[PDB]
Amino acid sequence: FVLSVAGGFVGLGNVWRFPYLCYKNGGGAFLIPYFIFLFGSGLPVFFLEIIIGQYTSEGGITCWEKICPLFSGIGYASVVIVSLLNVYYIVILAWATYYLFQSFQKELPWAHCNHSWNTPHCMEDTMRKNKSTNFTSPVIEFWERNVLSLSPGIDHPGSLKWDLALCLLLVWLVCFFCIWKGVRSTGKVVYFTATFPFAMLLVLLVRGLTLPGAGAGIKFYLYPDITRLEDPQVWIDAGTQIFFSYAICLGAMTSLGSYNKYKYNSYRDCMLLGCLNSGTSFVSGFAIFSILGFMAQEQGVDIADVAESGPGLAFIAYPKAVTMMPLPTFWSILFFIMLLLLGLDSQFVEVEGQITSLVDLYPSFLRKGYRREIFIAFVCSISYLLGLTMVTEGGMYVFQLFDYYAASGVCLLWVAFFECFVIAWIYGGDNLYDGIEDMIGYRPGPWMKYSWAVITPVLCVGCFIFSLVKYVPLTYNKTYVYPNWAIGLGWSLALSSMLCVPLVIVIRLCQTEGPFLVRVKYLLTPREPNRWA
Numbered sequence: 074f075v076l077s078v079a080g081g082f083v084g085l086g087n088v089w090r091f092p093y094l095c096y097k098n099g100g101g102a103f104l105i106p107y108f109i110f111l112f113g114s115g116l117p118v119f120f121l122e123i124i125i126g127q128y129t130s131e132g133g134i135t136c137w138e139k140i141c142p143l144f145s146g147i148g149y150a151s152v153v154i155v156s157l158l159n160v161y162y163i164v165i166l167a168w169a170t171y172y173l174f175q176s177f178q179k180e181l182p183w184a185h186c187n188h189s190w191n192t193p194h195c196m197e198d199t200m201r202k203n204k205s206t207n208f209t210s211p212v213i214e215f216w217e218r219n220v221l222s223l224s225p226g227i228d229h230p231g232s233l234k235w236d237l238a239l240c241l242l243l244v245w246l247v248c249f250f251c252i253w254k255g256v257r258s259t260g261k262v263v264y265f266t267a268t269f270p271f272a273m274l275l276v277l278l279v280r281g282l283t284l285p286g287a288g289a290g291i292k293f294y295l296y297p298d299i300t301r302l303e304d305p306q307v308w309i310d311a312g313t314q315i316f317f318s319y320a321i322c323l324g325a326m327t328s329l330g331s332y333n334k335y336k337y338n339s340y341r342d343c344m345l346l347g348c349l350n351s352g353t354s355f356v357s358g359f360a361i362f363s364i365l366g367f368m369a370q371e372q373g374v375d376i377a378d379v380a381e382s383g384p385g386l387a388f389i390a391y392p393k394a395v396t397m398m399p400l401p402t403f404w405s406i407l408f409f410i411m412l413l414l415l416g417l418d419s420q421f422v423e424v425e426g427q428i429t430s431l432v433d434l435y436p437s438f439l440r441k442g443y444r445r446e447i448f449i450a451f452v453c454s455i456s457y458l459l460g461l462t463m464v465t466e467g468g469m470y471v472f473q474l475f476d477y478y479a480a481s482g483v484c485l486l487w488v489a490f491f492e493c494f495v496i497a498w499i500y501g502g503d504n505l506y507d508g509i510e511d512m513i514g515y516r517p518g519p520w521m522k523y524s525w526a527v528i529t530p531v532l533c534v535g536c537f538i539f540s541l542v543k544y545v546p547l548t549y550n551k552t553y554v555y556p557n558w559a560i561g562l563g564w565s566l567a568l569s570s571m572l573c574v575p576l577v578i579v580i581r582l583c584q585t586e587g588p589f590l591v592r593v594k595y596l597l598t599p600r601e602p603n604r605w606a
């Protein structure tokens with residue numbers, strides 16, 4: 074149906090990122106700011122970007138020049154954000170490829186621990202209750218000592234891991250020869266593409282719900298502990314997860330909406346897609362936390378200490394689940410194929426959009442003087458060389474710093490706040506409503522206007538100031554304290570995109586003649602936003 078063509082309601086942000094962020098922040102208290110942000114700023118900004126693209130019929134950069142020439146740095150900020158995100162979004166795919174290649178033997182490597190990479194502290198999970206120190210689980214030991222080979226800190230990069238580097242090269246070469254060729258989909262594969270992840274998720278959920286101790290996991294996942302709400306990090310993580318999953322503030326939704334017709338009702342579509350995305354994110358937590366509760370019951374420890382409080386939660390939990398099913402290798406192969414399929418489509422779309430946006434800036438020297446293939450190869454090679462920094466023995470710390478500052482946090486709240494503020498208080502909410510009534514056929518209600526003028530601005534500014542007043546530095550797995558220069562580099566990563574609006578404002582102000590007031594009054598006037606008809 075239209076849902077099959079719509080897709081996007083499933084992604085790695087729903088399967089890999091939401092459960093680990095919910096588990097890190099206690100679980101249950103994460104859901105109040107999550108839903109508050111979802112119904113206060115998530116859907117309205119998505120609809121605003123879609124409608125701006127549809128109205129202007131322009132991409133992510135040229136659309137802001139026809140609405141407010143002064144505030145034209147939002148497109149450059151989005152370009153920088155997407156460029157930073159494309160570097161580290163593919164290490165997850167590299168890990169999935171490594172796991173898939175490792176799951177082709179007669180026995181799964183993480184089922185038992187008697188191998189070369191194990192330690193004397195390891196014991197089988199089913200025999201821990203017989204005896205009881207510092208004992209460890211075979212699956213965690215596998216993930217930490219065979220795939221990662223963790224070092225004592227970020228300042229100990231150790232040596233490059235050649236198998237992970239080759240997997241990264243393989244996934245980047247898959248991205249190439251497909252972005253270049255242009256093969257995206259057909260009229261027969263989309264039925265299997267959009268149905269396989271849901272079938273796998275249903276199988277995993279059914280398996281998890283029947284395990285002993287699942288009720289404790291559900292209670293942990295659903296009970297809203299209140300005293301955790303005084304920490305700004307819960308609010309920031311819950312708010313930025315919605316932005317990350319919806320792929321807003323990246324310049325992609327504007328381009329997607331630019332392909333719609335002028336007379337098309339996208340309001341109902343933006344609501345359906347958002348609701349389905351949120352529901353898909355919410356459902357898989359049940360399976361994840363039922364598995365976690367079963368593991369806690371089996372090992373005789375707390376649910377808050379069984380697994381990693383970081384990005385490896387899925388790679389620790391899901392293989393444990395597939396080890397409890399008949400024919401485990403078949404299910405492992407299916408699960409990791411599904412993960413790769415989920416990741417590759419988003420990576421393809423994002424890299425293609427970034428390349429198109431970068432080419433559009435210089436159409437003369439990137440279409441005639443230089444071919445597009447050379448530019449694509451250069452971008453891919455630079456991204457691979459940059460991402461080589463996260464496949465060493467101390468690359469997990471570098472990955473955690475880019476997933477906290479590069480494409481989330483204060484940098485995603487800055488862009489959203491400036492978009493909403495510009496639209497609400499310069500162009501005009503009533504003017505935008507008149508346009509929307511012209512296109513979609515009927516006038517919307519007052520929810521979108523108030524979310525653009527009051528709710529989104531207050532939430533963004535309030536969360537930012539709260540974090541600075543009660544400051545707490547970033548940690549890894551609750552125990553690693555990063556050095557000061559690492560925090561400085563992480564903040565520079567966000568500032569590199571945050572500093573795009575004032576600089577463009579200064580350039581525009583200096584590139585005009587006349588009095589200051591005259592200059593400001595001229596760069597604030599929209600320039601024929603809808604020219605078609």
Ligand SMILES: CC(C)CCC[C@@H](C)[C@H]1CC[C@H]2[C@@H]3CC=C4C[C@@H](O)CC[C@]4(C)[C@H]3CC[C@]12C
Pocket residue numbers: 149153569572573576577580581
């Ligand atoms: C005003 C427009 C039309 C033309 C001028 C565009 C200029 C002002 C914009 C476009 C892209 C922007 C740059 C994008 C990336 C970086 C890298 C960061 O480390 C320093 C800021 C810096 C250097 C930005 C500063 C301003 C910038 C150069």
Ligand SMILES: CCCCCCCCCCCCCCCC
Pocket residue numbers: 149152153154156157434569
């Ligand atoms: C450290 C992050 C770097 C991210 C780089 C993204 C692209 C930056 C260049 C964008 C276009 C600049 C030229 C625009 C001239 C009008």
Ligand SMILES: CCCCCCCCCCCCCCCC
Pocket residue numbers: 174175236239240242243
């Ligand atoms: C024992 C488990 C298997 C470990 C070996 C990993 C294989 C890595 C695959 C990538 C090799 C291809 C290089 C790039 C293609 C030209």
Ligand SMILES: CCCCCCCCCCCCCCCC
Pocket residue numbers: 227228229230462471
């Ligand atoms: C004693 C050796 C120090 C090891 C630190 C190296 C860590 C790598 C961090 C660099 C990441 C690049 C960010 C800026 C480029 C976009």
Ligand SMILES: CCCCCCCCCCCCCCCC
Pocket residue numbers: 483484486487490533534537
């Ligand atoms: C009438 C003058 C309005 C000028 C608004 C300037 C806002 C500058 C940024 C304020 C803080 C935004 C934080 C968003 C979340 C990081």
Ligand SMILES: [Cl-]
Pocket residue numbers: 086087091314315318350351354
């Ligand atoms: Cl989500």
